[PDB]
Design a protein around this ligand. Structure first.
Ligand SMILES: *[C@@H]1O[C@H](CO)[C@@H](O[C@@H]2O[C@H](CO)[C@@H](O[C@@H]3O[C@H](CO)[C@@H](O)[C@H](O[C@H]4O[C@H](CO)[C@@H](O)[C@H](O)[C@@H]4O)[C@@H]3O)[C@H](O)[C@H]2NC(C)=O)[C@H](O)[C@H]1NC(C)=O
Ligand SMILES: *[C@@H]1O[C@H](CO)[C@@H](O[C@@H]2O[C@H](CO)[C@@H](O[C@@H]3O[C@H](CO)[C@@H](O)[C@H](O[C@H]4O[C@H](CO)[C@@H](O)[C@H](O)[C@@H]4O)[C@@H]3O)[C@H](O)[C@H]2NC(C)=O)[C@H](O)[C@H]1NC(C)=O
Ligand SMILES: *[C@@H]1O[C@H](CO)[C@@H](O[C@@H]2O[C@H](CO)[C@@H](O)[C@H](O)[C@H]2NC(C)=O)[C@H](O)[C@H]1NC(C)=O
Ligand SMILES: *[C@@H]1O[C@H](CO)[C@@H](O[C@@H]2O[C@H](CO)[C@@H](O)[C@H](O)[C@H]2NC(C)=O)[C@H](O)[C@H]1NC(C)=O
Ligand SMILES: *[C@@H]1O[C@H](CO)[C@@H](O[C@@H]2O[C@H](CO)[C@@H](O)[C@H](O)[C@H]2NC(C)=O)[C@H](O)[C@H]1NC(C)=O
Ligand SMILES: *[C@@H]1O[C@H](CO)[C@@H](O[C@@H]2O[C@H](CO)[C@@H](O)[C@H](O)[C@H]2NC(C)=O)[C@H](O)[C@H]1NC(C)=O
Ligand SMILES: *[C@@H]1O[C@H](CO)[C@@H](O[C@@H]2O[C@H](CO)[C@@H](O)[C@H](O)[C@H]2NC(C)=O)[C@H](O)[C@H]1NC(C)=O
Ligand SMILES: *[C@@H]1O[C@H](CO)[C@@H](O[C@@H]2O[C@H](CO)[C@@H](O)[C@H](O)[C@H]2NC(C)=O)[C@H](O)[C@H]1NC(C)=O
Ligand SMILES: N[C@@H](CCP(=O)(O)C[C@@H](CCC(=O)O)C(=O)O)C(=O)O
Ligand SMILES: N[C@@H](CCP(=O)(O)C[C@@H](CCC(=O)O)C(=O)O)C(=O)O
Ligand SMILES: *[C@@H]1O[C@H](CO)[C@@H](O)[C@H](O)[C@H]1NC(C)=O
Ligand SMILES: *[C@@H]1O[C@H](CO)[C@@H](O)[C@H](O)[C@H]1NC(C)=O
Ligand SMILES: *[C@@H]1O[C@H](CO)[C@@H](O)[C@H](O)[C@H]1NC(C)=O
Ligand SMILES: *[C@@H]1O[C@H](CO)[C@@H](O)[C@H](O)[C@H]1NC(C)=O
Ligand SMILES: *[C@@H]1O[C@H](CO)[C@@H](O)[C@H](O)[C@H]1NC(C)=O
Ligand SMILES: *[C@@H]1O[C@H](CO)[C@@H](O)[C@H](O)[C@H]1NC(C)=O
Ligand SMILES: [Ca+2]
Ligand SMILES: [Ca+2]
Ligand SMILES: [Cl-]
Ligand SMILES: [Cl-]
Ligand SMILES: [Zn+2]
Ligand SMILES: [Zn+2]
Ligand SMILES: [Zn+2]
Ligand SMILES: [Zn+2]
Lengths: 694, 694
């Protein structure tokens, strides 16, 4: 038979291993020839695997690269302008790669050029609360200082935005062993820890969903009108550069001024972690000097788009997408995901060659320039937004399949909770000690839901990956799953070798998943999700799961407001409309579920499938969120303090955030009230899409 | 049988006459008790007629009314502050109505309060080109002057906006006999001309599609957050008041300063039509003083929404809507349309009682507060936008059925051209001298297309009626039809008794349509359109008609640009992308038409019906037009100089308008280029919705 089991059984760990090896022998940096060649290879193989059509969709977008003949570095400079210490010009290459060409040296993509010199201030993780502590409690002023911050906890672009608004004239990012060196494990190549010479590349944009900085709202095609660089979206105004902890130690060890306010500011280096500004007495006339010479350049990028036409509903799209571009070799990010997608295409193609077609159309994507701000997925979605708006069922992301080997990690819309629970109950656990047990059983045991007994944790969607345009801008039901570590507070920090030259095929094969059983398990979850979405007669969404979370989020935002009871009294701030809307949604969704079960009629079915498909669509506000026109979902948005984290009722959340510090409380509370109205209205409007249609 | 003929034959002139009489015995001003009572009557009758459900949808919106105990008027004031002449406090009531209560005196709705005194400047129709002539050619400065303008040619709100930006401190609108008194016809009550004491009420907002001034983007429901009046949308900043031509004559006769620049500035009054500023030597110390005391007040309004559930596609909506609120009796505007809607509901209900149901759902609407800025339709559409976005097939408007008795006047999307041509060929002409000939034949003869032989004129959609939110904001295929006059250059001016107390049932019965044959003909066109849209198996839209007009519009906008060849050379301004897109649209639409003809499969049918329904949707840009976020259609928008007129490629048009006067030509031409890109992209994207789906 041609059923989900046939599909799943065709998937092979061995094939995933072969493809991972194949995708990770050379770097595949966006906008380079090596990545175009890999695009063409994938396009060819997907055709061979049996897809109906496979095309490259290209765009010309703003990318950023170091100057090959004028390298970036940081110095300590003495009284006389002698550079007495220089940071490294490249990461020592790993064994057997010391002759590989075209390894991009560590840099912060989209940094402006500059050579600022000044005194250092240490800002911990450069989070909003870190800057509050500095400025409000410690009375330290960052204006005209070079800030140094440890990577971790939040997206690096948020750190740079926070530094810029504190008046910093430059930012130095570094990897502290506290966040990037697990106790009792060896440095690469002998284990999975970050060596002192290792450095994390990554972009530092604040795009808020815009895509290519030069063409917000429209695809960066051949005739596109581009903004001038001065009007570009999201570019940092101060130079930024990343370094390893050997180099960081040299910059931190001399630091003077104030002591760290408490232990949560101290990393693992043998230094005081003094905040500054500047160095201790003896070195007080030494400064830090950055040298940044990178250039932003409009460059062609290439997405691969494969189509497997649906047999019954060809005009309904289920999309499996993930990126292909890497900083260097991409042994985990993204090739552990790309290899999984490749094996899923192969398996679907095997069924198709035997005469099977899915019910709905399945689109497969290999996105480009993900590392430079989700550029490829965003531009494609801008080009095809009308088709996606009216036909998009669901989007399943497929970046890194592993970031650990401990348990499953799933983030998705509530609409997919039941699908995930059901599928994971049908799949075998790969975990030691859970042999013959379901994936659902190991996951729930290792990652328990904070709200429910005998249920697994499923997290919210924010941004920092290619689902963002589909979910936050267009309102298409989205999900993602991967294997992860135990390390709770390291959730948003990355595994240790993240975005370093050490992230190789050998890293994965030796230390992460020698048998490729975790990869296989993730291929089963991602592929099985796509299978059910593309093939189930009734779409596998349960609107009642949205009703349950909406109540939890309404309780939560109410509880935040209720920290300010006097203001709620003064300004008559009521959440009654929001709770009414959530109650209504719960009642209507219950009735709709009854009809979905109680309803041979393909019109009533598709009518009902359309109500299910457009339910996520209904949470979109066409006016967008305040000053973030491309984040249009009213229930979720990327956190304004951390792009990686999803925030619920973001418009009300941001209206409430730090509100006790606002100069005009009347105005600030009026805005909270406006956001409550928008939220209550959108919840009610979404509810009403599930009512009987006439 | 139950077919279109059964429906059409059930419609009766006699019934339309009875309903018109019934709706026009007392005023039905929005937000008054008399209009709420009429709402409830209609709700009752629609239920009795057989509709499945009929509900009132209420909102609380900003309305405007004179102060009953502090009347509005204008004076000529002498040196000593004696008011030597006062304009009228009310229009002399017509025969037999001289004891009717609750006739609102003439006023300009949403005028601010004030008592400005100053010198007059006469500004012709206060159009953009009139102000150009004054300021640029005649060097007359309106700053701190009271402007007097004749009604006609453009929407009155455009006149007020133009006056405000010329620095006027007040505006006096009047009805000139040149525009409102047809040669050889008697004044009301003895003919259809405007008496010297008659005055045209009307709102003077510049809402640009926002709806209720206080709640742009969201329905004005019970819990709505409202903007403060100072942040309200579209309110005029200077007092405004309308007067008749007896009063106007008194204000104009003393005018001095410069002579009218030419004859197109001279009306029909026995006065010089001097521009001013101020009065001739003898009266040079006399001033004009306005006294405006009207108040803006949040007030409840009521839409009636009737549903006739579809038998096969209940989740597809065809909407027939028109307003119920009038300035006074509304004998033409809107009751000649409302009576037609009432008879259409009755006829559909007769079929339904005999067991028939249309294929798709038909929604019938009696909108409130249309006269105060399309408030009722807009608020309802804001509340239901998700349902309309995903389910709305078409909207047919139904305001005044007659504004003359000469021929048909149709404005609609190109998608409906074929439907209208076909339907009008099947209907009998009501015209004298065309007995036994088709409506198509009389219409084409009397209103020939400027572009095609043996085709009738069909005009573009702008705004100034309740289709605006559906078409310009939401992108739902819209149309309208009515009977009209010959008077070409009076197209946007109104028939003479427009918005005056003289617009009565007797006006219509005696002078316009004694036999109600023109009303019947319009009921047949509107009802027949609804019938075909709600019942045809394949939606009756022809995408090839859009391809033809897109080429005409692209030729037109190119021709405007080509007045500036040196600039197009300097700035490399190419329309090639736009023509490419139009060519592509033409090719794809041709192929889609072939498939639509070449395709027993209900999925392929509905897939194809969905491609037809979402085609109008595809011309929507979610970012809207520049500084007009609620006008989102890229091919059409209300003219920025005249809300009543549709403009094609409005974004490029406005970028080009008066461009030779821009201070930074580089910037101005860069914007033209940006708009060409947006237009080319949107045309191509719309084209691609008609491609094979996978
Ligand atoms: C959740 O669903 C329910 C429907 O089950 C929905 O209930 C509706 O609530 C509105 C707003 O409260 C009700 O509005 C009232 O409507 C009546 C006419 O039906 C009016 O007369 C009321 O106005 C008077 O009273 C107000 C309150 O004191 C005054 O401010 C006002 O000046 C008037 O005196 C009022 O508009 C509506 O009737 C119900 N509909 C029902 C029960 O069918 C509720 O709104 C939904 N929640 C959300 C957030 O949408
Ligand atoms: C109307 O429909 C047609 C499809 O029939 C569509 O044609 C497409 O036009 C684009 C833009 O011109 C073509 O883009 C080219 O794509 C090739 C790869 O296929 C590139 O190598 C080209 O780039 C080179 O040449 C450029 C021009 O000199 C240079 O600027 C650039 O630096 C490169 O050297 C270029 O991107 C595309 O191939 C066709 N597609 C076809 C024929 O299938 C057209 O765009 C549609 N109209 C609109 C307005 O969308
Ligand atoms: C990755 O696998 C691909 C596909 O097997 C390899 O590309 C093929 O290599 C052979 C030998 O050079 C060529 O003849 C084919 O034309 C290629 N096929 C393609 C591109 O579809 C490629 O060599 C592998 N890369 C690595 C590093 O192992
Ligand atoms: C850090 O690098 C800088 C730049 O290469 C070195 O300073 C340069 O040294 C050369 C050779 O002595 C001089 O000719 C240049 O004028 C210097 N350029 C400067 C100051 O920018 C410096 O020696 C290096 N420092 C260390 C400790 O290795
Ligand atoms: C997850 O699986 C459960 C258990 O099978 C599904 O819930 C059942 O659905 C069937 C089929 O309609 C109903 O008749 C049962 O009453 C349901 N059992 C329950 C609610 O416990 C559920 O639909 C699946 N979820 C999906 C497919 O999204
Ligand atoms: C307009 O027609 C309506 C409906 O025929 C009339 O309202 C009815 O009048 C009778 C007599 O007063 C009442 O008993 C009914 O309850 C009314 N029916 C309704 C409101 O549905 C109304 O009188 C007519 N108005 C005029 C001016 O002729
Ligand atoms: C125009 O109307 C004004 C206002 O009613 C008249 O002026 C008022 O006249 C009364 C009675 O003489 C005075 O007591 C008021 O003080 C006047 N109020 C003003 C100047 O605002 C005026 O007489 C009328 N003019 C004409 C020509 O009828
Ligand atoms: C308007 O009527 C014309 C003439 O009947 C329709 O065009 C015909 O449609 C039929 C039915 O599919 C085709 O087989 C003919 O070839 C068409 N004749 C032509 C193009 O001259 C047209 O479809 C109608 N338009 C509507 C219903 O929107
Ligand atoms: N761990 C994260 C990051 C994966 P990523 O591919 O590395 C994304 C990349 C760009 C994100 C952006 O620009 O928004 C970055 O975070 O630097 C995840 O799994 O989702
Ligand atoms: N002749 C016009 C006007 C009919 P209307 O009902 O009178 C509309 C009303 C308000 C329009 C607005 O606010 O946008 C007005 O123009 O004053 C037509 O038929 O379409
Ligand atoms: C790279 O290095 C030097 C620095 O000016 C110069 O030769 C060249 O312009 C640079 N390339 C750039 C800026 O892209
Ligand atoms: C921070 O330092 C700069 C130094 O010139 C100054 O302009 C700024 O106002 C300072 N802010 C505070 C609050 O200390
Ligand atoms: C894989 O799992 C084993 C067993 O707990 C563990 O010791 C090892 O650290 C894991 N590998 C990684 C990279 O987490
Ligand atoms: C109407 O007339 C007078 C003018 O002030 C006053 O008695 C009353 O306030 C006015 N009503 C208003 C302003 O609504
Ligand atoms: C128009 O008149 C006012 C009078 O003060 C003045 O401010 C304004 O600049 C004048 N404009 C021109 C161009 O005459
Ligand atoms: C109706 O038509 C007749 C015949 O042309 C004409 O004389 C009369 O003016 C028309 N009525 C109106 C109101 O236009
Ligand atoms: Ca773009
Ligand atoms: Ca509103
Ligand atoms: Cl992922
Ligand atoms: Cl109309
Ligand atoms: Zn990635
Ligand atoms: Zn990455
Ligand atoms: Zn009207
Ligand atoms: Zn009107």
């Amino acid at each position: 038979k041609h059923n989900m089991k046939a599909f799943l059984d065709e998937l092979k760990a061995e094939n995933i291993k072969k493809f991972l090896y194949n995708f990770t022998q050379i770097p595949h940096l966006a906008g380079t020839e090596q990545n175009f060649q890999l695009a063409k290879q994938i396009q060819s193989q997907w055709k061979e695997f049996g897809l109906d059509s496979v095309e490259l969709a290209h765009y010309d977008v703003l990318l950023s690269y170091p100057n090959k003949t004028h390298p970036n570095y940081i110095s300590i400079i003495n009284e006389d302008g002698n550079e007495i210490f220089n940071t490294s010009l490249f990461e020592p290459p790993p064994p057997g790669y010391e002759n590989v060409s075209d390894i991009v040296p560590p840099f912060s993509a989209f940094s402006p050029q500059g050579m600022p010199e000044g005194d250092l201030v240490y800002v911990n993780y450069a989070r909003t609360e870190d800057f509050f502590k500095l400025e409000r409690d410690m009375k330290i002023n960052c204006s005209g200082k070079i800030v140094i911050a440890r990577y971790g906890k939040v997206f690096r672009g948020n750190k740079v935005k926070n530094a810029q608004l504190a008046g910093a004239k430059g930012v130095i990012l570094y990897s502290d062993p506290a966040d990037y060196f697990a106790p009792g494990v060896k440095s690469y190549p002998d284990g999975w820890n970050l060596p002192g010479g290792g450095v994390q590349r990554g972009n530092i944009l604040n795009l808020n969903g815009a895509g290519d900085p030069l063409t917000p709202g429209y695809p960066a095609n051949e005739y596109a009108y581009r903004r001038g660089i001065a009007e570009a979206v999201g570019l940092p105004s101060i130079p930024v550069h990343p370094i390893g902890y050997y180099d960081a130690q040299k910059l931190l060890e001399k630091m003077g001024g104030s002591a760290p306010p408490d232990s949560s500011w101290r990393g693992s280096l043998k230094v005081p972690y003094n905040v500054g500004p500047g160095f201790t007495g003896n070195f007080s006339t030494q400064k830090v000097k950055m040298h940044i010479h990178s250039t932003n350049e409009v460059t062609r990028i290439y997405n691969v788009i494969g189509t497997l036409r649906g047999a019954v509903e060809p005009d309904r799209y289920v999309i499996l997408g993930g990126h292909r571009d890497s900083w260097v070799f991409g042994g985990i990010d993204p090739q552990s995901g790309a290899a999984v997608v490749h094996e899923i295409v192969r398996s679907f193609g095997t069924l198709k060659k035997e005469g099977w077609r899915p019910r709905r159309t399945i689109l497969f994507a290999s996105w480009d320039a993900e590392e430079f701000g989700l550029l490829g997925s965003t531009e494609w979605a801008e080009e095809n937004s009308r088709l996606l708006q009216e036909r998009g069922v669901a989007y399943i992301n497929a970046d890194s399949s592993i970031e650990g080997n401990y348990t499953l990690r799933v983030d998705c819309t509530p609409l997919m909770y039941s699908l995930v629970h059901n599928l994971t109950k049908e799949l075998k656990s790969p975990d030691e000690g859970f042999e013959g047990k379901s994936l659902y059983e190991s996951w729930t045991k290792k990652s328990p839901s904070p709200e429910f007994s005998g249920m697994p944790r499923i997290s919210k969607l924010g941004s920092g990956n290619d689902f963002e345009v589909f979910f936050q801008r267009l309102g298409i039901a989205s999900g993602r799953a991967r294997y992860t570590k135990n390390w709770e507070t390291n959730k948003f920090s990355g595994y240790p070798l993240y975005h370093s030259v050490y992230e190789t095929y050998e890293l994965v094969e030796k230390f992460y998943d020698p048998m490729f059983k975790y990869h296989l398990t993730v291929a089963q979850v991602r592929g099985g999700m796509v299978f059910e979405l593309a093939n189930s007669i009734v779409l596998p969404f349960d609107c009642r799961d949205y009703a349950v979370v909406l109540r939890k989020y309404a309780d939560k935002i109410y509880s935040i407001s209720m920290k300010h009871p006097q203001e709620m009294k003064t300004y008559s701030v009521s959440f009654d409309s929001l709770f009414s809307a959530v109650k209504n949604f719960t009642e209507i969704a219950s009735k709709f579920s009854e009809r979905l079960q109680d309803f041979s009629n393909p019109i009533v079915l598709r009518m009902m499938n359309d109500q299910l498909m457009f339910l996520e669509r209904a949470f979109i506000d066409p006016l967008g969120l305040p000053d973030r026109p491309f984040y249009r979902h009213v229930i979720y948005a990327p956190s304004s303090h951390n792009k990686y984290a999803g925030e619920s009722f973001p418009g009300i959340y941001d209206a409430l955030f730090d509100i006790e510090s606002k100069v005009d409380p009347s105005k600030a509370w009026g805005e909270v009230k406006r956001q409550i109205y928008v939220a209550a209205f959108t919840v009610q409007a979404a509810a009403e899409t599930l009512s009987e249609v006439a």
